[PDB]
Design a protein around this ligand. Structure first.
Ligand SMILES: *[C@H](O)[C@H](C[C@@H]1CCNC1=O)NC(=O)[C@H](CC(C)C)NC(=O)OC[C@H]1C[C@H]2CC[C@@H]1C2
Ligand SMILES: *[C@H](O)[C@H](C[C@@H]1CCNC1=O)NC(=O)[C@H](CC(C)C)NC(=O)OC[C@H]1C[C@H]2CC[C@@H]1C2
Lengths: 297, 299
């Protein structure tokens, strides 16, 4: 049971290159609008305390170079929504999928299409951490890469990439340009809040290990919801809500293990450890699989 | 480090479904040919030991339902190459990428586009184990899903999925229909060789740790390749080949650490263990990142 991303084809058909001055990053081309991080308009001087409204009014349409492969698109208008720049182009993208813009909740997962110079490079599954960072593979030039989920024929865009933090995690915005977390698109070293582990996902992953015939960590003991949550919070795990319990039902039924029985197992793991053992190959409890992710696979 | 897959769009554009009677699996549409597992022509009663040659003589072009989405593709010829069926169709796929058929080596990694009834479900990275199995997420109806790598804009197809083993791992063929490993496409119990650790990938991981400034495990000594291989076998590590030594070339050059010196460091980890330490934030050595994978995510 391994990490699985959504097929990326519908998003690849939307990726373009956006250049301003010496700065090049990725944009998302939907209908006749290209969305990208606004810091593309910055220079080295600008980056430490950029007054974006000032920097933007000083720009004209012709200062933006948008390339779809070898083809230049003509920018006929530009505006800013929070931290995203929107470039109107004279051409519509025929490859535009059915889509929506969503803001995801912490603990939810999405796929990331990592792009450089407008070209797709890799795809992988991320979780929005409780402290609103994401543990990604993003290098120089990845800005403007997007995260998404696919439901039926519909792409829900939830993330656009903007920056790295000193710890090596990453930060960005929704497609309305609002950051996830307390971060700012300026060139400073920023720390996040204290991270916590996503408990409902750890429980989904234990159920997955059981479904894969793997149960050394199970026990006959049980716990109340509140007593589990006391121990969880002691270990900087998120408390488990009753909707979380509800959401775990299908995995509960399928294995015949009551949610609160699995909570008692997790409690024992937190207090004791894995004592050399592994679960699904891992020496660590994994919290980037949602119940939905587990079920569908 | 993440398991990271290649963007799947160029492969999505080639996926179709192939049906015989009520048996539907996936196929791969490139130019005017559709490639799929030959056991699409089997009923339940034929699967324990199909006579594939006899089953095929009974088939005509008009017995094959090939669909891209809900749109039928007319079949105008059929043949069998090893364990794959090749169906000539009357339309060249307009989304055919530049492509190659490659046969990979154990330890190499590839992306799998998991498909059901010709529709993509997900993409993920797999390593081919030294016993020629992969640990995928393959459910009923995933046969004919393919594995691939993408170089420049050329898709190298390396795997087509055919079966599951009793232990829960998976087996399949290259796109010329030749199985990886000692397996056959019959619904019988077959056992894989005991698996081993992919030494070349562990070495790549150690190089990755050095590139990131985590280098406590480097020592002042070296080893011969044969001495290393004889020790490695005692810890259920795969022996290194000359190709393994060569594909470590770039990382050795990037770090200035000779391949055989890194082998001497690995030998020490094998014999003494980690003694409470971690590498890249893990007490376990990772063996599913190739030297190519490491360079992609570092540089
Ligand atoms: C846009 O492509 C990049 C993506 C970064 C670069 C390295 N890895 C990434 O994910 N974003 C930036 O360049 C960004 C620009 C500012 C104006 C929002 N700055 C940034 O990521 O700085 C990272 C700095 C901060 C401390 C951690 C690493 C260095 C020092
Ligand atoms: C084609 O979609 C399926 C994919 C299988 C089914 C579940 N997981 C998979 O990888 N392949 C088969 O159905 C295959 C057909 C024969 C002709 C090769 N049979 C198969 O994989 O069965 C494996 C045997 C071995 C023991 C496990 C299940 C049975 C008994």
């Amino acid at each position: 049971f391994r990490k699985m991303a959504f097929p990326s084809g519908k998003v690849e058909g939307c990726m373009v290159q956006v250049t301003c001055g010496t700065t090049t990053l990725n944009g998302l081309w939907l209908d006749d609008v290209v969305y990208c991080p606004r810091h593309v308009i910055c220079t080295s001087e600008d980056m430490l305390n950029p007054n974006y409204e000032d920097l933007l009014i000083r720009k004209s349409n012709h200062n933006f170079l948008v390339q779809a492969g070898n083809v230049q698109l003509r920018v006929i208008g530009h505006s800013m929504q929070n931290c995203v720049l929107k470039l109107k182009v004279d051409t519509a993208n025929p490859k535009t999928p059915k889509y929506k813009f969503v803001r995801i909740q912490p603990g939810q997962t999405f796929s990331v299409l990592a792009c450089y110079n407008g070209s797709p490079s890799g795809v992988y599954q991320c979780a929005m951490r409780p402290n609103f960072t994401i543990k990604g593979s993003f290098l120089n030039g990845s800005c403007g890469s997007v995260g998404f989920n696919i439901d039926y024929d519909c792409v829900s865009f939830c993330y656009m990439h903007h920056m790295e933090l000193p710890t090596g995690v990453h930060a960005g915005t929704d497609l309305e340009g609002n950051f996830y977390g307390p971060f700012v698109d300026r060139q400073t070293a920023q720390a996040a809040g204290t991270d916590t582990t996503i408990t409902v996902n750890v429980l989904a992953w234990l159920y997955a290990a059981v479904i894969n015939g793997d149960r050394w960590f199970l026990n006959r003991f049980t716990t109340t919801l509140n007593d589990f949550n006391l121990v969880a919070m002691k270990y900087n795990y998120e408390p488990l809500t009753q909707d979380h319990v509800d959401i775990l039902g299908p995995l509960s039924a399928q294995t015949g293990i009551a949610v609160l029985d699995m909570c008692a197992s997790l409690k024992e793991l937190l207090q004791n450890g894995m004592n050399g053992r592994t679960i699904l190959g891992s020496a660590l409890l994994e919290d980037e699989f949602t119940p939905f992710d587990v079920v569908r696979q």
